[PDB]
């Protein structure tokens, strides 16, 4: 394969004659395609966070576990998301959505979830107070594309509703290989934290997983179909 070009077909995958292994590469035989000297490794880290949310009940689409992309409420009018605690906010961008960490001193006071279509009115590091609005839900607010939601909780008072969500999302990171390095784990690997992914000549370049997650392999030096 020309350097830099990834493989459209995965590792340890059966291929039929005529099928492309790559943009300029066509298979001459039926068999099992195998990666040879991958130029890059892709580690998808699992990030899990238990958070909170407050939405009018008129809006709410009532659901036990929300899948990625699934519709969360309808939000009739644009809605200020009002902080139920007091602290310094930590604004973290996750793709479409946001996370707001309310922190006093060191330990955190609260954890707030901001789905897609609920827009943040505050800034990272800024100080907020009880009742001071944070986000603004504009219509809609379907759940994020890469993130799922499990173990919902329901607290209802009048119009408002308060929900604690167990959130599961994938934070991808790309790791560059070297000729001095070698990949230990297979394709579509089930991997834990602090585990060696790609060994090397020196422990320095050794790839160590920062979190429990899934391992993908990309950009082979060549593809051997057997």
């Amino acid at each position: 394969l020309p350097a830099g070009v990834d493989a459209l077909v995965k590792d340890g995958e059966e291929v039929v004659k005529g099928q492309e292994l790559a943009p300029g590469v066509v298979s001459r035989m039926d068999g099992v395609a195998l990666y040879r000297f991958p130029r890059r490794v892709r580690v998808d880290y699992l990030r899990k966070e238990r958070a909170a949310l407050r939405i009018p009940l008129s809006a709410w689409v009532e659901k036990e576990a929300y899948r990625p992309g699934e519709v969360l409420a309808e939000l009739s009018e644009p809605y200020l998301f009002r902080a139920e605690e007091s602290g310094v906010v930590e604004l973290k961008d996750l793709a479409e959505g946001h996370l707001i960490y309310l922190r006093q001193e060191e330990e955190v006071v609260a954890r707030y979830f901001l789905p897609a279509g609920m827009t943040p009115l505050v800034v990272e590091g800024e100080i907020v107070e009880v009742g001071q609005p944070l986000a603004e839900g504009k219509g809609l607010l379907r759940l994020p594309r890469h993130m799922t939601a499990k173990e919902v909780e329901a607290e209802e008072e009048g119009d408002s509703v308060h929900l604690t969500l167990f959130l599961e999302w994938t934070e991808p990171k790309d790791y560059k290989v070297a000729p001095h390095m070698n990949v230990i784990v297979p394709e579509g690997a089930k991997v834990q934290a602090g585990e060696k992914i790609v060994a090397a000549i020196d422990p320095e370049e050794e790839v160590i997983a920062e979190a429990e997650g899934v391992v993908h392999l990309h950009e082979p030096a060549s593809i051997l179909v057997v």
């Binding site: 000297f37 000729p179 001095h180 070698n182 000549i201």
Partner: protein, 114 residues
Amino acid sequence: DPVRQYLHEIGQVPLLTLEEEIDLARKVEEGMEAIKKLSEATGLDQELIREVVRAKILGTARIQKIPGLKEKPDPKTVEEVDGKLKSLPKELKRYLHIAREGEAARQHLIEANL
């Protein structure tokens, strides 16, 4: 012409890129250290298990019967150490496989550098 023959024969096997080179060397050393670890496993010498693995690799019956008419018996001292190394738990087993692969890598490396 024998020279033509051999030159073409080695002309068949390609060269080795830096990646391949380093990887093969690595696999070889891993194989050797696996043999040493197996020496700590069953309590037998390195070259012993080494030559056994070779006897399982670079030919079935041909390594034994003709380095001269007398060496180490085929059904007897080869196969019993084979079966003795067969009867170990998982780690020593994966190290057996690793050792074999190391031997193969050694062979290929030898060819390009031929």
